[PDB]
Amino acid sequence: SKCPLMVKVLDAVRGSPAINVAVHVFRKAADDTWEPFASGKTSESGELHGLTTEEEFVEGIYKVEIDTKSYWKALGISPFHEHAEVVFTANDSGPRRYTIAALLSPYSYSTTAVITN
Amino acid sequence: CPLMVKVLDAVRGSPAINVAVHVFRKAADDTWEPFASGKTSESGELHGLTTEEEFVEGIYKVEIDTKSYWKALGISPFHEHAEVVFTANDSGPRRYTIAALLSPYSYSTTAVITNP
């Protein structure tokens, strides 16, 4: 099916997918506050699918919050960040799939968006 | 300087100049209160945000306005902004450098921590 939004999390310390990381997605509401939208835990391949459907994923401002702090603490590593947040606008401009990827280290993270048809 | 921000542009191979940065501190009531703000200089650095006295233990949020920066260059970027949220000075005062490397659809952030 078409998954309009997927998240992929990788671990730069161990060279593997970041498994069981909690991810919360929010949608910016009218009052300019964040309403919970979807959530889950990355799988064994460091992925999280089925967050939403095309009908529900309308244009708007979304926040993807990745709980990196609990992931490093589970490994016994003291991390710097409270969490990693990706805030973006979803735009209808031809059909699209969004992949938010995050690469984690204790004191650093990178995030990239891969938008495909 | 207990807190300094450095922003680089990965598309042009230069410092990211005139990027607005807003810092907030989590207040008692779980809300973010405005702590300091500024613009990156010609070398892509932002100094003088706070003093050791004012920079108490707490959860801080450094929000870098990356969208305006790319928009002023003619590029429509993916992210609304880059946010770095962290606990500071929970074991005594430190000097924190938050560095950000920017691209239109990607950003990376690192912290370099120094003991006074």
What is the rounded distance in angstroms from the CA atom of residue A83 to the CA atom of residue A97? 24
Hey, are the CB atoms on A87 and B106 less than 8 Å from each other? Answer: no
Hey, are the CB atoms on B78 and A85 less than 8 Å from each other? Answer: no
Residue count (chain A): 117
Nearest to B80 among A61, A80, A83 (CB): A61
Establish if A59 touches chain B: CB-CB under 8 angstroms: no
E-assigned strand segments in chain B:
3-9, 14-15, 20-26, 32-39, 45-46, 58-64, 79-88, 95-103, 106-114
What is the rounded distance in angstroms from the CA atom of residue B95 to the CA atom of residue B112? 8
Contact call for residues A61 and A97 (beta carbons, < 8 A): no
What is the rounded distance in angstroms from the CA atom of residue A9 to the CA atom of residue A60? 23
The residue to which tokens 């810092």 are assigned: B23
The residue to which tokens 């992929």 are assigned: A8
Chain A residues touching B79 at Cβ < 8 A? 86-88, 113
Residues 29-48 of B with CB under 8 A from A: none
Residue A50: half-sphere exposure toward Cβ, Cα within 13 Å: 4
What is the rounded distance in angstroms from the CA atom of residue A95 to the CA atom of residue A84? 27
What resolution in angstroms does the PDB record give?
1.9
DSSP B62: E
Angle CA B61–B62–B65, to nearest 5: 130
A18: closest CA among A65, A77, A52, A67?
A67
Structure tokens that stand for A43 in this block = 């799988």
Structure tokens that stand for A7 in this block = 């998240």
Hey, are the CB atoms on A88 and B79 less than 8 Å from each other? Answer: yes
E-assigned strand segments in chain A:
5-11, 16-17, 22-28, 34-41, 47-48, 60-66, 81-90, 97-105, 108-116
Supply the Cα-derived Rg of chain A in whole angstroms.
14
Alpha carbon separation from A91 to A68, B60, B92 (Å, rounded): 27, 30, 45
Establish if B75 touches chain A: CB-CB under 8 angstroms: no
Domains of chain A: 1-117 (2.60.40.180)
